[PDB]
Write a protein that binds this ligand. Sequence first.
Ligand SMILES: CCCCCCCCCO
Length: 157
Amino acid sequence: EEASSTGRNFNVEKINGEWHTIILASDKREKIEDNGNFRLFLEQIHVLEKSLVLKFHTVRDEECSELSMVADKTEKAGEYSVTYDGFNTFTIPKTDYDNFLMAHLINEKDGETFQLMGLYGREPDLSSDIKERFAQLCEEHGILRENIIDLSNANRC
Ligand SMILES: CCCCCCCCCO
């Protein structure tokens, strides 16, 4: 079964646990390229009453560095916010809890904005079919495939 965080049947406790960044996408590609601040490798999500504790690592010159963030529920169901290189809000438009999680994020920094979409997997990679469903979701948000970067061959330290 699948759900959206904004849906009535969403069960947030079920996204708790291990995750891996499989693909990242953005309508401002530089943000997720090699030295971009948003090329974040998710490791785990800890679900709390009114927040999600997100654990990631970033890479630079082949060197990993850990980073944690706390995302707070906003006033709209299924939406969370977190301060990181500007102000961010995000939702989970689609997840099946056991294999994949697709997130949509809006960043606002210095009066600007951009969209980021992420495909996370319970294992370090996902099937080609789920990767295609992610490309379709990116298309629905006006993000071209050439702005979608598969990081499954670079998500481990
Ligand atoms: C559901 C938790 C993941 C939300 C998306 C975070 C994106 C970070 C920038 O890559």
